[PDB]
Design a protein around this nucleic acid. Structure first.
Ligand SMILES: [Mg+2]
Ligand SMILES: [Mg+2]
Ligand SMILES: [Mg+2]
Ligand SMILES: [Mg+2]
Ligand SMILES: [Mg+2]
Ligand SMILES: [Mg+2]
Ligand SMILES: [Mg+2]
Ligand SMILES: [Mg+2]
Ligand SMILES: [Mg+2]
Ligand SMILES: [Mg+2]
Ligand SMILES: [Mg+2]
Ligand SMILES: [Mg+2]
Ligand SMILES: [Mg+2]
Ligand SMILES: [Mg+2]
Ligand SMILES: [Mg+2]
Ligand SMILES: [Mg+2]
Ligand SMILES: [Mg+2]
Ligand SMILES: [Mg+2]
Ligand SMILES: [Mg+2]
Ligand SMILES: [Mg+2]
Ligand SMILES: [Mg+2]
Ligand SMILES: [Mg+2]
Ligand SMILES: [Mg+2]
Ligand SMILES: [Mg+2]
Ligand SMILES: [Mg+2]
Ligand SMILES: [Mg+2]
Ligand SMILES: [Mg+2]
Ligand SMILES: [Mg+2]
Ligand SMILES: [Mg+2]
Ligand SMILES: [Mg+2]
Ligand SMILES: [Mg+2]
Ligand SMILES: [Mg+2]
Ligand SMILES: [Mg+2]
Ligand SMILES: [Mg+2]
Ligand SMILES: [Mg+2]
Ligand SMILES: [Mg+2]
Ligand SMILES: [Mg+2]
Ligand SMILES: [Mg+2]
Ligand SMILES: [Mg+2]
Ligand SMILES: [Mg+2]
Ligand SMILES: [Mg+2]
Ligand SMILES: [Mg+2]
Ligand SMILES: [Mg+2]
Ligand SMILES: [Mg+2]
Ligand SMILES: [Mg+2]
Ligand SMILES: [Mg+2]
Ligand SMILES: [Mg+2]
Ligand SMILES: [Mg+2]
Ligand SMILES: [Mg+2]
Ligand SMILES: [Mg+2]
Ligand SMILES: [Mg+2]
Ligand SMILES: [Mg+2]
Ligand SMILES: [Mg+2]
Ligand SMILES: [Mg+2]
Ligand SMILES: [Mg+2]
Ligand SMILES: [Mg+2]
Ligand SMILES: [Mg+2]
Ligand SMILES: [Mg+2]
Ligand SMILES: [Mg+2]
Ligand SMILES: [Mg+2]
Ligand SMILES: [Mg+2]
Ligand SMILES: [Mg+2]
Ligand SMILES: [Mg+2]
Ligand SMILES: [Mg+2]
Ligand SMILES: [Mg+2]
Ligand SMILES: [Mg+2]
Ligand SMILES: [Mg+2]
Lengths: 76, 61, 100, 59, 45, 111
RNA sequence: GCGUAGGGAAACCGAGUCCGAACAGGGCGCAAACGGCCCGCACGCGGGCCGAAAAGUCCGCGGCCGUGGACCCGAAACCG
RNA sequence: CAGGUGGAGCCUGGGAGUGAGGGCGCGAGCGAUAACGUCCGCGUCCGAGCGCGGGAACAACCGAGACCGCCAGCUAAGGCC
RNA sequence: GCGGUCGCCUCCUAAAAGGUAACGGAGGCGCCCAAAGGUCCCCUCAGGCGGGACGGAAAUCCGCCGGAGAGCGCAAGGGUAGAAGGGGGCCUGACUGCGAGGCCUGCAAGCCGAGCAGGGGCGAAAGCCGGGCCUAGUGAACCGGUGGUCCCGUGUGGAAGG
């Protein structure tokens, strides 16, 4: 057989769901492209990884044509 | 007979005041013509976990 | 033993300076005792007396350190901590040792 | 409107989360009756084991 | 081509990497030393 | 032909601005006049207005701009507002757009 | 001998120390437990006392581990 | 956010054994829409319930979790010439 | 046994979180780029039809139509023109000293990262910059080499060696 290979599962996906309490640092989404875009108080690292910029809670936003967004609405 | 301290362990590990086992960080002095300065810089000591229990046990003395 | 895999003998010694063949190098070892510790004494306090008390240990030279509060007594030692030299200069007097 | 639940069929061979419900209720033995507060949460488990239990309404 | 470029006194050796035969010149560029601050930095060894 | 260098360049520069979080000093300039608007996004609301067609002034529109520039400061700085970003939209930071910005002096600024 | 000081490769300093330009930051570290009797204002205080308890350490016992034949029996073999 | 006091949960530690699984159901790959085949997934039982009832006999299908005693009663599956 | 395989990335298998096996179905990595890096400013494709010397299916040009089927150094996927793509100007942050907090996770590793300080780059500024659209381009420890630097230097000053 010429096959037999594969790579390590990269455990990608959302790490904090809407209405979850996070903290400045907490990475909120692990993804390949820009499947989710950084919203309010949400940074995104060189591997497109979204994280809380401040403490607070997590909320999602589907801006249709404009894509989907993860916001960290404060409370801190 | 008297137990023997493990010199391999003593040469590369330290037991802290609270009984933590603190070792250096692997992978920073051999192949770094360029790893990120963040990479080579993040080489202080760390703490081994639940298995320094074993390292501790070969230094005891 | 980890079953054949390399163990955690895979970390690199830092404690560089492991010693060489003629051996350990003779040099004055200082042992620190705190102010709070000798607060029990009244009279003198010499590195000699402090062994009998059970604090000094015979192989080491005397160095009094900070933690604790000072007392108006004459304390004889080989070295004093910054914090300690001050703490007691406000009460008592203390000599430095270096004879024989 | 309290509920009277009664274990009538053995859970030997049913999913573990179903043995969990029979527990959440307090049912430990066959034929055992237990009268509990009729609430949404308490009904959840009662209808989950609906095939092993027999339910009546009581005062 | 593994590369280790240095400063201009007390050495330094903050190593980088130029792959090819072009850049093939002195292969130098402005960088920052751990000592003073921001100097020339040239390439060697 | 969907979207244009205009509409594009407009978003491009304006999208960046809206990230930094500050209040937006949006500048719309026309052939005859030049207007200025301090907007707060997330509240979707304007705070301080300052036009030239609203101050009925004229005479050399690079010099008019600066006037409506200083005009925006006064009105605004009196409301607490000090620090802001400054749009610029489709217009290169130049001429009467640059002028109004240079006029926005006497009020928070950094520009 | 163990314990009463730790941090550092070390020099060394020390309730701190190490990295550092840092009076950033972080790593690893220091912080007396109760009752009650005394007093500074009375219901505790603030610190002390009277002895409960205890870091620690010592011996006994028990589990388990390290080294030894190490739960018992058994090779094919190797060497003098 | 609520109910849920359970041989529940969490934390620190002492002692382990296991690291050869198997049948069945369901979902796939391999195989031949073969195997009491094989490899995963989610469940279950046997494993350790080779104790009890049914299935003629039969680890895992149905019923049912056996602390002890009774020449008492009601039932489950399954049955009632 | 013979043959094949052995680490890393992509896709499916995988049963709509994560994860998941087989000598299951298919591909790819062991590099590369001083610009293919940072920043500021501009620019928008592929195709299709019509038009136009040498121009041909296709060289360069004009017109309309063309939301992305182009491009993004190479596999695949995800992503993406409201740029991550194309062009130019300055520049080298392919920084030093750190690091809140997390992702992942048996260990050891691997990954993302705000913010502070030093000294800088581009920008009017807001600001961005601790390499590259991202996910492969990799190797614990031991033993040594090389350049520094304080540190130790076996009676002492050196030196040897660390
Ligand atoms: Mg496989
Ligand atoms: Mg995969
Ligand atoms: Mg949806
Ligand atoms: Mg690289
Ligand atoms: Mg091996
Ligand atoms: Mg059953
Ligand atoms: Mg370097
Ligand atoms: Mg001890
Ligand atoms: Mg010491
Ligand atoms: Mg030490
Ligand atoms: Mg230093
Ligand atoms: Mg220092
Ligand atoms: Mg500090
Ligand atoms: Mg601390
Ligand atoms: Mg006692
Ligand atoms: Mg005792
Ligand atoms: Mg034994
Ligand atoms: Mg024998
Ligand atoms: Mg012989
Ligand atoms: Mg609750
Ligand atoms: Mg339990
Ligand atoms: Mg436990
Ligand atoms: Mg244990
Ligand atoms: Mg095994
Ligand atoms: Mg197995
Ligand atoms: Mg299996
Ligand atoms: Mg099983
Ligand atoms: Mg099974
Ligand atoms: Mg069978
Ligand atoms: Mg069926
Ligand atoms: Mg079968
Ligand atoms: Mg089988
Ligand atoms: Mg079943
Ligand atoms: Mg067995
Ligand atoms: Mg049975
Ligand atoms: Mg069972
Ligand atoms: Mg039998
Ligand atoms: Mg039987
Ligand atoms: Mg039978
Ligand atoms: Mg039977
Ligand atoms: Mg029972
Ligand atoms: Mg019974
Ligand atoms: Mg009957
Ligand atoms: Mg019946
Ligand atoms: Mg019959
Ligand atoms: Mg072979
Ligand atoms: Mg899945
Ligand atoms: Mg065309
Ligand atoms: Mg044509
Ligand atoms: Mg033509
Ligand atoms: Mg595409
Ligand atoms: Mg591609
Ligand atoms: Mg693609
Ligand atoms: Mg795509
Ligand atoms: Mg470009
Ligand atoms: Mg450029
Ligand atoms: Mg961390
Ligand atoms: Mg890696
Ligand atoms: Mg890359
Ligand atoms: Mg070796
Ligand atoms: Mg060496
Ligand atoms: Mg070496
Ligand atoms: Mg010297
Ligand atoms: Mg000698
Ligand atoms: Mg000498
Ligand atoms: Mg050397
Ligand atoms: Mg040297």
């Amino acid at each position: 057989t010429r096959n037999g290979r594969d790579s390590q599962a990269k455990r990608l996906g959302v790490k904090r769901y809407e209405g979850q309490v996070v903290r400045a640092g907490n990475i909120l989404v692990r993804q390949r492209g820009t499947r989710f875009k950084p919203g309010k108080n949400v940074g995104m690292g060189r591997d497109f990884t979204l994280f809380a910029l401040v403490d607070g809670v997590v909320e999602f936003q589907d801006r249709g044509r404009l894509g989907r967004y993860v916001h960290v609405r404060p409370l801190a | 007979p008297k137990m023997k301290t493990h010199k391999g362990a003593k040469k590369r590990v330290k037991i802290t005041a609270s009984g933590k086992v603190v070792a250096m960080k692997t992978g920073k002095r051999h192949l770094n013509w360029q790893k990120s300065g963040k990479e080579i810089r993040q080489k202080g000591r760390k703490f081994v976990l639940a298995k320094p229990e074993a390292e501790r046990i070969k230094l005891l003395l | 033993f980890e079953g054949g895999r390399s163990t955690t003998l895979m970390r690199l010694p830092k404690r560089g300076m492991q010693g060489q063949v003629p051996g350990e190098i003779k040099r004055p070892r200082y042992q620190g005792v705190n102010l709070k510790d000798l607060a029990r004494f009244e009279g003198e306090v010499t590195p000699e007396l402090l062994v009998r008390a059970g604090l000094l240990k015979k192989g080491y030279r005397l160095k009094i350190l900070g933690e604790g509060e000072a007392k108006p007594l004459k304390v004889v030692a080989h070295a004093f901590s910054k914090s300690a030299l001050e703490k007691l200069k406000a009460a008592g007097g203390e000599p430095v040792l270096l004879e024989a | 409107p309290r509920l009277k639940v009664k274990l009538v069929k053995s859970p030997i061979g049913y999913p573990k989360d179903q043995k969990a419900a029979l527990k959440a209720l307090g049912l430990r033995r066959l034929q055992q009756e237990r009268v509990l507060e009729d609430t949404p949460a308490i009904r959840g488990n009662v209808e989950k084991v609906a095939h092993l239990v027999r339910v009546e309404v009581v005062e | 081509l593994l590369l280790e470029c240095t400063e201009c006194k007390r050495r330094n050796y903050a190593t980088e990497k130029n792959k090819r035969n072009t850049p093939n010149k002195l292969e130098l560029r402005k960088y920052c030393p751990w000592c003073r601050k921001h100097t020339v930095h040239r390439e060697v060894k | 032909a969907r979207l244009t260098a205009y509409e594009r360049r407009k978003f491009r520069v304006r999208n960046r601005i809206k990230r930094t979080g500050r209040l937006r000093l949006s500048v719309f300039r026309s052939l005859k006049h030049i207007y200025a608007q301090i907007i707060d996004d997330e509240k979707g609301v304007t705070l301080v207005s300052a036009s030239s067609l609203a101050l009925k002034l004229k005479g050399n529109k690079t010099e008019v701009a600066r006037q409506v520039g200083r005009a925006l400061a006064e009105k605004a700085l009196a409301l607490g507002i000090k620090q802001v970003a400054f749009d610029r939209g489709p217009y290169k930071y130049h001429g009467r757009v640059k002028a109004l910005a240079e006029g926005a002096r006497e009020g928070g600024l950094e520009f």
